Amino acid sequence: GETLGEKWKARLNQMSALEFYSYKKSGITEVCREEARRALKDGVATGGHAVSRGSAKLRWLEERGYLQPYGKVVDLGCGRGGWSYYAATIRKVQEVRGYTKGGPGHEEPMLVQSYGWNIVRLKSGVDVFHMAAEPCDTLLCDIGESSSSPEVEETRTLRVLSMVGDWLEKRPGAFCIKVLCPYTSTMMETMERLQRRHGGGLVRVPLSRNSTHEMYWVSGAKSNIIKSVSTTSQLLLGRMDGPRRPVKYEEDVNLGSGTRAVASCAEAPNMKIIGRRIERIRNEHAETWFLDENHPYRTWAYHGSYEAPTQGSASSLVNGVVRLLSKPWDVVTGVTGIAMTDTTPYGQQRVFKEKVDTRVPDPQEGTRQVMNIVSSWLWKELGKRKRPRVCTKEEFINKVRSNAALGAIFEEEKEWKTAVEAVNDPRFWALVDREREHHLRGECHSCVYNMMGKREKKQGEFGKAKGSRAIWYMWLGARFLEFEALGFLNEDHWMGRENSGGGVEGLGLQRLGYILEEMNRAPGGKMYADDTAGWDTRISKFDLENEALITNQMEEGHRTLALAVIKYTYQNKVVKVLRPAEGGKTVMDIISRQDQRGSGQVVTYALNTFTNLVVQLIRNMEAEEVLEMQDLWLLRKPEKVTRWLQSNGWDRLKRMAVSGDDCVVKPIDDRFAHALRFLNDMGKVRKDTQEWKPSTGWSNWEEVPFCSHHFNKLYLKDGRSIVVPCRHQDELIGRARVSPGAGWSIRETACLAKSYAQMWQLLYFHRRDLRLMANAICSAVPVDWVPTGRTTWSIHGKGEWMTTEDMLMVWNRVWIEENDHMEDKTPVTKWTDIPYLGKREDLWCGSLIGHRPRTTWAENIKDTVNMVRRIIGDEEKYMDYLS
Ligand SMILES: Nc1ncnc2c1ncn2[C@@H]1O[C@H](CSCC[C@H](N)C(=O)O)[C@@H](O)[C@H]1O
Ligand SMILES: [Zn+2]
Ligand SMILES: [Zn+2]
């Protein structure tokens, strides 16, 4: 016997177009989305508006008592986030995690600053069917797709309930999952079993058009299932006759704005150390100083806030001359997605809360000892044929570029427009001389960190630009005290390969491949290139204690200055950063922390290299059965560690290649793939993998990623061989066609395009698309125009391409004449003699040789280039690099 709902769907389909239109809204309740859609069309994220209707559905279920949200809220099919953003406003809710399918056709999560947005984490591109269930407190799901055939809605609704059946197996205290088709005979005793097993009932939310029978399976309900589904069918059937009734209008929920207070687990401040700097900042902005009860800092100590103007932008321009010369890539999402990052207060605080506001537990006691042994042995190793020294002011002057950040904080430090101007003002060196005096008296007065978002070219997130990574540096006078105490590590090349065996400091991309090729000649197992997830946030206070052991090899007075710069600046940090507030105003927060590593410290690269070496040196020990599982707690016989280093330490170092946090290790066997107890206990958890799954290695060294590239071995036409770097072509092109500028002129972007083109000729000459596209750009840009900009942030991209000199002449200097891996120094005089990658690897790394749209782009490039010359201006002087 067909159910009442099946007779409702029978009539619903038999209606005509006009019958349907009169019935869809007849007598339903509806929220007022007018004054919300406009603010959302303008970009007003501080308006307290809800991102969709579904937010008002959730409130109705809450007021009635059907839903009691709390704890970790998981929101399957969160859409724009209507359910997630409302959940983050409830008193008992403390974490919101929503997932949705993105891409074309589907809604992507919105970015709004409603109340509690800091506890929200939305992720797109997720298909919840292929997503394993995790424990949670509140489970939300709003995933159906209406159709017209009840056999499809039943099939789709059954498929949904087989997916949420795994999540409910984890016993969530509250849930609200959407049943799209509850009215069929099969769907009724599918729900009858699920109600016996998990409880709750079916509720019909009046904020729903009469054209769907959808009901929500909520936890605070207990109405009988057939009675629930059928009573709704009688309402929907009854509305099909006769008169059309008015729609009742409610007022939309207003979620508010700001952040919400959070449980604090931050370490106890050392107000004897950082107290003077906090007082100095508070007194400077004393007129607007206050304490915000709603600050979002879990693992940083909070000291106060004051009103401040906003900084940064979320805008990203396009390079017109690269975009025209790279037409066939306008349909590749691999390049069209690359756009600048978002450095506004919201843009960085959004990434800060998830990535930098963390707290890794202290390593165990045996671990902490092994670290101390290996680190003290590594400093003694590095400092054998090399001694620490104090660097001078005369050195620091000749090392500040034009774009060295001043970075003042206190009013006395705000007297100069540029850094090179300040370093010539004797008042500047008076502030330094005055600060070092405080250091020698055990105090610190000026050394405070500036934090902000780094401006990069990365793949977008949702529809918009991705949030920004944090960079932090101190004011110029404090950065000099840093330099004269620890700068010897950089200026004396402690981390170079000659001194450390495993370092690579100072080298460029044009030489790293020869190190991996040499590393493959020694015997052993596969190569391993695991990466720590967010390295600068795992540098514990014990990692910092071990780095401070360099001060043992110092003259006593030099040890004093370094310890003042370490005890007051590295082991205690006073950070200044912006945050959005309630109402659109932006505010400055003063926070403090006692672990992690600042990105802009003078010795960041050197110390990250040191600690990463110590990490891989220990992981070799666990893999060779020197350290056991009892050793993590209490170090058994410590003499067994000192002997493994004295016998094999220098050889394992020769088997590595470490640049900062990036590393590649060639162990002696594949036990290194599953030596993880010390790796995890030190906080150095690996990236994009499960915390205990053994790692994967490469049998082929021409595939190992290192410093964002891999390296292939090529052979010049007749004879010699070079080892070149290579990466996926889509991000090389994609970065080149995004211009960082804020309204640049045509001449100025055409210069930025000559930089990406000439860099390609130097490092990626072996990519058929880039070799052609670089000649096309260099033919469309005037010859005498000098390249501007920055085509890479890599410390290994040295920049031999930022020149007007002939590119073939700077090519020979880099790859032949000044390449020590080149016995024969015969010059190369024609580009046609410089080879390509194999047609297989080109395609594998993003090339489009065989595709029709690229074959046409090639044979039209001369006409394409002549069209670009009129756009730069055909009265300029051009050369024909295309032949
Ligand atoms: N298999 C799947 N995996 C993840 N998301 C899916 C999915 N199938 C559909 N979706 C998404 O789930 C969303 C449900 S709409 C619900 C959104 C939310 N209630 C709000 O108030 O905004 C749709 O946007 C759809 O794109
Ligand atoms: Zn100081
Ligand atoms: Zn490649």
Author numbering: 5 to 887
Quoted passage from the original study:
Nonstructural protein 5 (NS5) is essential for the replication of the flaviviral RNA genome. The N-terminal portion of NS5 contains a methyltransferase (MT), followed by a short linker that connects to the RNA-dependent RNA polymerase (RdRp). The MT adds the 5′ RNA cap structure to facilitate translation of the polyprotein and to decrease elicitation of the host innate immune response. The RdRp initiates RNA synthesis by a de novo mechanism wherein a single-nucleotide triphosphate serves as a primer for nucleotide polymerization.
We expressed the full-length NS5 from ZIKV strain MR766 that was originally isolated from Uganda Africa and determined its crystal structure at 3.0 Å resolution. Two zinc ions are found in the fingers subdomain and at the junction of the palm and thumb subdomains of the RdRp. The overall structure of the ZIKV NS5 has striking similarities to that of the JEV NS5, with the RMS deviation of 0.55 Å for 751 Cα atoms. The MT of the ZIKV NS5 connects to the fingers subdomain of the RdRp and overhangs the NTP channel of the RdRp. The MT interacts with the fingers subdomain of the RdRp primarily through a hydrophobic network that involves residues Pro113, Leu115 and Trp121 from the MT and Tyr350, Phe466 and Pro584 from the RdRp. The total buried surface area between the MT and the RdRp is ∼1,600 Å2. Full-length NS5 only has one conformation in the corresponding region and it resembles that of conformation 2. Notably, motif F in NS5 binds with the MT and has a different conformation relative to that in Δ264. The net effect of the presence of the MT is that the RdRp has a reconfigured template channel and possesses a more open NTP channel.
